[PDB]
Amino acid sequence: LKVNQDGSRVLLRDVAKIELGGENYDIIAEFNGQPASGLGIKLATGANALDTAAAIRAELAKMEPFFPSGLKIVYPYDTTPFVKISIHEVVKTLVEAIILVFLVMYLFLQNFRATLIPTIAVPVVLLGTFAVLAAFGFSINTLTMFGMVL
Amino acid sequence: DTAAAIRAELAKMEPFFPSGLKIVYPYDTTPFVKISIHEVVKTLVEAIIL
Amino acid sequence: AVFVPMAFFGGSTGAIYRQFSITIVSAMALSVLVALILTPALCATMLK
Amino acid sequence: GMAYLFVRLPSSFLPDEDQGVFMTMVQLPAGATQERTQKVLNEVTHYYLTKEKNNVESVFAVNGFGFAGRGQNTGIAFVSLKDWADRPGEENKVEAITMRATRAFSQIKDAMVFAFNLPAIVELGTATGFDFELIDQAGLGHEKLTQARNQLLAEAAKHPMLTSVRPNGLEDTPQFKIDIDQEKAQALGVSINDINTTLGAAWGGSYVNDFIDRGRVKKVYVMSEAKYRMLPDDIGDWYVRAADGQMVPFSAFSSSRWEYGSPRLERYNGLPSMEILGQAAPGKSTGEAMELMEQLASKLPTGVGYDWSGNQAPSLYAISLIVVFLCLAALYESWSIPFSVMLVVPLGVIGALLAATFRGLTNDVYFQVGLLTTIGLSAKNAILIVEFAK
Amino acid sequence: GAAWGGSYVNDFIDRGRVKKVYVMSEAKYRMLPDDIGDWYVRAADGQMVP
Amino acid sequence: DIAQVQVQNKLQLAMPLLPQEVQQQGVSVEKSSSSFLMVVGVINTDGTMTQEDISDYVAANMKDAISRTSGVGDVQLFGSQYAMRIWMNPNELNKFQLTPVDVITAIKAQNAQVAAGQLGGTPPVKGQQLNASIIAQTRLTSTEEFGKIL
Amino acid sequence: GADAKTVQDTVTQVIEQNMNGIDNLMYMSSNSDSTGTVQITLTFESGTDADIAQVQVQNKLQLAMPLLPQEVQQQGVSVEKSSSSFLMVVGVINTDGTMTQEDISDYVAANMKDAISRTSGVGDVQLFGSQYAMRIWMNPNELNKFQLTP
Ligand SMILES: Cc1cc(N)c2ccccc2[n+]1CCCCCCCCCC[n+]1c(C)cc(N)c2ccccc21
Numbered sequence: 010l011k012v013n014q015d016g017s018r019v020l021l022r023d024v025a026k027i028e029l030g031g032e033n034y035d036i037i038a039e040f041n042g043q044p045a046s047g048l049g050i051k052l053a054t055g056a057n058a059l060d061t062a063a064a065i066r067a068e069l070a071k072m073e074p075f076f077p078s079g080l081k082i083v084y085p086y087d088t089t090p091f092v093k094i095s096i097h098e099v100v101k102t103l104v105e106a107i108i109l110v111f112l113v114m115y116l117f118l119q120n121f122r123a124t125l126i127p128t129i130a131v132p133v134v135l136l137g138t139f140a141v142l143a144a145f146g147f148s149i150n151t152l153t154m155f156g157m158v159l
Numbered sequence: 160d161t162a163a164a165i166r167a168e169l170a171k172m173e174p175f176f177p178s179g180l181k182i183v184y185p186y187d188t189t190p191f192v193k194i195s196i197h198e199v200v201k202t203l204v205e206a207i208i209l
Numbered sequence: 210a211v212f213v214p215m216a217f218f219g220g221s222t223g224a225i226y227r228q229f230s231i232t233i234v235s236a237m238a239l240s241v242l243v244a245l246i247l248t249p250a251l252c253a254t255m256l257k
Numbered sequence: 258g259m260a261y262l263f264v265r266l267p268s269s270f271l272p273d274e275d276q277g278v279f280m281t282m283v284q285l286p287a288g289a290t291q292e293r294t295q296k297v298l299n300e301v302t303h304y305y306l307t308k309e310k311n312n313v314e315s316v317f318a319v320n321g322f323g324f325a326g327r328g329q330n331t332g333i334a335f336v337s338l339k340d341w342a343d344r345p346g347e348e349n350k351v352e353a354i355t356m357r358a359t360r361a362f363s364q365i366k367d368a369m370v371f372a373f374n375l376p377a378i379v380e381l382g383t384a385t386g387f388d389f390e391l392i393d394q395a396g397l398g399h400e401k402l403t404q405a406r407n408q409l410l411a412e413a414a415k416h417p418m419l420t421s422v423r424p425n426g427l428e429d430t431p432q433f434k435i436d437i438d439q440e441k442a443q444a445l446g447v448s449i450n451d452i453n454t455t456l457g458a459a460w461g462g463s464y465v466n467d468f469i470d471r472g473r474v475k476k477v478y479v480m481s482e483a484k485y486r487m488l489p490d491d492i493g494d495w496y497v498r499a500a501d502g503q504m505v506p507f508s509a510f511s512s513s514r515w516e517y518g519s520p521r522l523e524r525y526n527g528l529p530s531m532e533i534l535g536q537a538a539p540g541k542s543t544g545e546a547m548e549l550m551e552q553l554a555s556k557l558p559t560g561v562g563y564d565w566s567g568n569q570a571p572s573l574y575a576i577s578l579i580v581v582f583l584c585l586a587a588l589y590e591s592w593s594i595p596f597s598v599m600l601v602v603p604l605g606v607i608g609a610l611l612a613a614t615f616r617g618l619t620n621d622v623y624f625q626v627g628l629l630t631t632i633g634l635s636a637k638n639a640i641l642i643v644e645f646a647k
Numbered sequence: 648g649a650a651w652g653g654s655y656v657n658d659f660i661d662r663g664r665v666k667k668v669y670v671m672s673e674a675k676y677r678m679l680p681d682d683i684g685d686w687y688v689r690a691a692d693g694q695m696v697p
Numbered sequence: 698d699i700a701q702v703q704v705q706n707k708l709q710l711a712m713p714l715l716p717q718e719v720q721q722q723g724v725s726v727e728k729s730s731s732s733f734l735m736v737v738g739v740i741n742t743d744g745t746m747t748q749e750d751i752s753d754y755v756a757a758n759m760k761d762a763i764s765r766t767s768g769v770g771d772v773q774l775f776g777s778q779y780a781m782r783i784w785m786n787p788n789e790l791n792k793f794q795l796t797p798v799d800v801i802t803a804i805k806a807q808n809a810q811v812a813a814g815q816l817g818g819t820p821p822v823k824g825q826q827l828n829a830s831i832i833a834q835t836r837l838t839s840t841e842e843f844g845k846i847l
Numbered sequence: 848g849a850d851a852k853t854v855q856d857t858v859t860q861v862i863e864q865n866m867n868g869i870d871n872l873m874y875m876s877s878n879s880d881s882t883g884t885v886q887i888t889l890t891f892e893s894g895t896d897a898d899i900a901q902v903q904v905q906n907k908l909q910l911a912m913p914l915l916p917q918e919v920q921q922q923g924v925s926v927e928k929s930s931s932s933f934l935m936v937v938g939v940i941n942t943d944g945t946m947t948q949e950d951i952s953d954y955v956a957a958n959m960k961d962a963i964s965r966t967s968g969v970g971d972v973q974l975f976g977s978q979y980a981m982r983i984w985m986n987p988n989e990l991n992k993f994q995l996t997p
Pocket residue numbers: 144145
């Protein structure tokens with residue numbers, strides 16, 4: 010900074026403290042009352058959702074490896090397993106609706122052969138709607154999946 | 160559509176104006192459209208009747 | 210005649226009512242073609 | 258009946274559901290600090306960790322970051338509930354979690370904390386709800402505009418078949434103004450450049466340069482120890498060099514005095530504007546409250562304007578009624594069959610209404626299509642009662 | 648350039664909207680070529696120069 | 698849509714090879730149409746104002762909205778938006794000993810807003826009660842105030 | 848450093864005037880914060896292409912760019928795809944080799960964050976702390992007794 014008359018060397022250290030710290034101390038995170046930082050991946054207008062977050066491989070897959078001592082990953086507020094559940098409760102619905110129809114088919118048609126045609130009719134029709142909606146740009150949305158069911 | 164939109168144009172710019180300020184329309188495309196449609200839809204109906 | 214007309218969606222109620230008709234409207238034509246090709250043929254093939 | 262079972266049944270858009278994941282934000286009064294707000298965020302973290310173990314898998318608190326905006330006033334905790342199998346009851350489920358949680362924050366506290374089901378939906382379309390905004394169309398300032406917004410918020414609550422209306426977040430906190438006498442400055446012998454980059458560099462911070470640290474280039478920042486810039490008396494400590502190689506205090510050329518400004522000035526569409534988040538009345542629903550809010554904003558002073566199932570169905574269904582008759586005569590020519598089927602419509606729909614009017618449902622999106630599917634089966638049933646019989 | 652042509656100095660505030668500040672000179676001191684001499688620039692040695 | 702982008706992006710590689718007078722002025726890239734359609738005149742009758750007062754209010758309430766509104770390629774302005782105008786007298790500059798570089802520098806100092814920090818700073822001392830923003834210099838307001846510059 | 852009135856018309860307003868002549872657009876909004884941080888939001892018609900819609904705003908923005916404080920120019924200007932709604936919010940903590948709520952925010956933002964934002968169409972990433980920075984705490988008494996300024 011300066012050299013005062015008597016060759017006394019004024020340094021930046023003498024006039025001011027110097028520590029390696031944050032560039033902005035406005036916000037601070039405490040995971041369950043314990044200090045920490047992280048990431049808040051916000052989506053893009055139009056992005057694929059369970060595809061952005063499902064990709065990976067990644068996410069951060071090759072960011073869960075060379076970490077030093079103590080550094081670990083942990084997951085709060087996560088969309089993922091809600092998807093995993095709504096698919097699973099509709100594909101459950103689907104199969105229940107087949108089995109339950111297969112009984113009503115038997116109850117009226119004592120013919121086993123006959124409780125078999127309609128059982129083996131709609132399996133095909135379902136797939137067609139996956140082949141048709143994929144071709145129209147639609148997805149396995151919350152909507153289109155209850156549309157299989159409805 | 161640009162000129163027909165509005166609502167707007169300047170619709171909520173023909174309101175809080177102070178003393179004396181008024182809008183007025185020279186050189187305007189609009190009513191030429193309004194006329195060519197009307198003289199062809201007239202043509203149309205005349206051609207049916209005839 | 211009642212699904213595809215309501216498939217004329219609007220604004221933020223876009224896909225919403227759309228996917229609703231179409232998804233199943235698609236499922237109507239696929240259920241009809243199956244009930245005009247397969248379900249018929251199979252029902253002949255082996256019913257009784 | 259069928260009609261009355263429907264007109265009276267309220268209309269929502271899409272049902273808010275437990276997601277295994279909710280959140281809850283914080284907000285302190287005029288110009289609170291990072292240490293005061295952090296005390297609240299602790300109390301919130303605790304209700305969740307102690308009084309809700311059988312429920313809360315993990316929190317993730319954040320001091321200084323609202324969803325209004327940011328600053329030392331705001332906050333937010335990110336919750337992550339324990340999976341739905343281990344968490345069975347209706348009390349266990351999020352509707353009830355954000356009920357006694359919100360009860361606790363409006364009880365054993367002295368600020369503002371809430372909690373909400375993450376609106377699965379999209380941000381917009383709460384239904385029986387609003388998004389108003391109050392523009393200044395003329396030469397008025399932020400100060401006169403504010404008073405008109407106070408008169409809007411007032412008149413709605415002064416005469417609400419009601420409404421529930423509040424501002425968005427302009428609290429309106431004071432600000433330590435520093436006037437620099439310009440004649441005095443140069444008489445003592447200081448450049449106004451050197452004075453400004455003293456105050457801005459000391460209290461606010463300053464992006465000087467970039468340096469290198471462990472490969473990645475980061476930034477160098479200059480400011481000062483906290484204790485020499487916490488209050489207004491610390492202004493005098495800073496001595497600027499004057500032309501005539503000798504120091505000069507701030508107090509010399511300064512003029513200390515407080516003021517009243519706002520810490521966030523919203524602007525809607527090129528002009529100043531302060532937004533108003535009200536809802537529909539507990540009786541009324543939107544189209545009512547909306548056109549019963551425009552008449553209150555029109556009874557405001559000069560230079561103050563404004564700007565904000567669905568009507569959808571009425572038309573959509575209209576074409577349902579027209580294509581039926583076509584298809585009911587593309588295979589069934591007469592004007593006899595196209596009026597048969599026409600009756601099975603509310604034969605079944607009366608029950609659809611009744612099942613959901615009895616239980617806790619509403620006229621949402623799934624219901625609206627549960628109708629048209631019920632009508633497609635009504636077609637079925639009847640059309641065979643006709644096709645076979647003809 | 649500042650006298651005859653104009654110069655974008657800064658921006659100021661007027662009735663809400665930020666506009667601009669311009670510097671130039673009265674018309675009559677820059678209408679013809681004889682008015683060039685009127686402008687006296689300061690020289691290092693604190694004194695004017697035509 | 699894309700054709701604009703390409704020209705307006707590779708333009709902004711030349712941008713710093715360009716006088717700083719011109720950079721702080723209006724560079725623009727738009728969709729051309731040598732052909733007006735709506736040319737809305739705007740006059741006064743009762744509370745009389747000039748061909749200058751109107752061009753300002755037009756361009757301080759209406760014009761900003763129009764250009765944006767309903768895909769308007771670019772708007773034309775028939776006059777000019779207001780501006781703090783200063784007519785430097787050369788004889789009055791001479792008899793005090795001054796230049797137009799001193800008037801300019803006086804406006805680039807007194808007429809400006811500055812970033813002053815805040816009490817209860819971003820990294821404070823644990824237990825401070827207050828946190829409010831500092832105000833400093835301000836952008837000027839009226840004719841009067843531009844007359845009292847030193 | 849800037850306050851809610853400074854940013855409101857040196858960065859905020861300068862953009863709003865120079866933010867027109869764009870295709871498909873119902874409205875714009877703004878938030879001029881007291882921390883010295885402004886963020887504007889343009890909302891387009893439903894089904895409009897977000898790819899091109901970004902371009903148009905971020906290109907005509909960069910005509911106003913040199914009408915903008917040089918503090919703000921060297922700071923982060925940004926144009927992104929909005930989605931007020933996180934999904935993956937990956938917490939990152941320490942257990943064994945203990946470090947602070949600052950050490951982690953740096954390593955997060957010096958190994959992981961840079962990759963994420965880019966990876967699989969992430970509109971924009973949030974950081975829960977701050978990346979490191981050579982911090983300097985100027986002492987005013989020690990500046991005076993050697994005769995110096997910041
Ligand atoms: C800028 C830009 C520039 C262009 N010159 C362009 C040209 C064509 C289309 C889009 C374009 N975009 C923007 C376009 C990216 C388009 C991603 C689209 C859909 C994918 C599959 C849907 N799909 C269906 C159903 C049916 C088809 N017969 C089919 C044929 C070819 C490709 C796709 C198809």
